Amino acid sequence: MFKAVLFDLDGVITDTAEYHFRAWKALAEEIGINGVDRQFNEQLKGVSREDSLQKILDLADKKVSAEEFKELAKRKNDNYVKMIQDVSPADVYPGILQLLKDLRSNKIKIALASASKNGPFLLERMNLTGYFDAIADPAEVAASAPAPDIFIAAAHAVGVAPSESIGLEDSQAGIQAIKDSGALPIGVGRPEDLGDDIVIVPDTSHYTLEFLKEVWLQK
Ligand code: BEF
Numbered sequence: 735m736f737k738a739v740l741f742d743l744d745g746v747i748t749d750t751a752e753y754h755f756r757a758w759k760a761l762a763e764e765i766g767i768n769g770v771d772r773q774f775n776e777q778l779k780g781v782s783r784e785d786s787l788q789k790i791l792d793l794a795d796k797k798v799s800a801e802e803f804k805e806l807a808k809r810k811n812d813n814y815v816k817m818i819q820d821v822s823p824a825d826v827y828p829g830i831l832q833l834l835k836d837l838r839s840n841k842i843k844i845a846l847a848s849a850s851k852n853g854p855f856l857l858e859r860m861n862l863t864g865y866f867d868a869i870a871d872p873a874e875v876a877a878s879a880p881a882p883d884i885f886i887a888a889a890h891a892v893g894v895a896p897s898e899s900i901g902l903e904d905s906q907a908g909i910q911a912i913k914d915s916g917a918l919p920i921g922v923g924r925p926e927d928l929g930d931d932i933v934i935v936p937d938t939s940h941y942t943l944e945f946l947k948e949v950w951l952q953k
Pocket residue numbers: 742743744745847848849850
C-alpha cells in the first residue's frame with residue numbers, strides 16, 4: 735500500500751484563487767489600469783507573480799523600471815496576505831478533512847507539497863497542522879513545477895521515496911511534477927487541462943482513502 739500522500743494546497747485543500755484575483759484587481763485599480771476583471775484573471779492562473787504583473791502592465795502598454803516592477807509585485811503580495819487573514823476551517827474543501835483523518839488513522843504519512851509560501855499559515859488558519867507530518871519549504875527548492883522538486887522534498891521529509899507516494903494536484907505543471915518525482919498523480923479537474931494519461935477526479939469529494947487505495951492497486 736502507498737505510504738504517503740503529498741498534498742498540493744491551492745485547488746486541493748482550499749481555494750486561494752479569489753484572494754489572488756481580488757489582490758490583482760485592487761492593484762490595477764490603484765495604478766489606473768482598466769480591464770482586470772474575472773475573465774482576464776483566467777490568464778493569470780498558474781502564471782508566476784511577475785509574469786502576471788507583466789500581463790496587467792501590458793493592458794495599458796505600461797513601462798516601468800525594475801525597481802518599480804518589484805514594488806508593484808510587493809504591493810500585490812501585501813494585498814493578498816491581508817486578504818487571507820480570515821481563512822478558516824469552513825474553507826477546507828469537501829472530503830479533505832475526512833481524508834486527512836483516515837490517512838492518519840491508517841498510519842499513512844501526510845506531507846504538504848505546495849508552491850505556497852503561506853502554506854504553514856494557511857494550514858494553521860484551517861486547523862489542519864496537526865495532520866501534517868511535514869511541510870516541504872518552497873523557498874528551499876531549486877525549481878518550481880513542472881520540476882519535481884517540491885514533491886521529492888515532501889516525500890523525503892516524511893521518510894519515504896516518491897515511488898511509495900500519491901500526489902494530489904489541480905494544475906497541469908503540478909501533475910507533471912508529480913509524475914517526474916516518481917509518485918503516482920491523481921488530479922482534480924479535467925483532462926483537457928491535466929492530461930488523459932493520469933487518473934483525474936471532478937472535485938475533491940472524490941479524494942477518499944478507499945478511492946486512493948483503488949487507484950494504487952490498479953497501478
Ligand atoms: F498549493 Be499548490 F502549489 F496549488
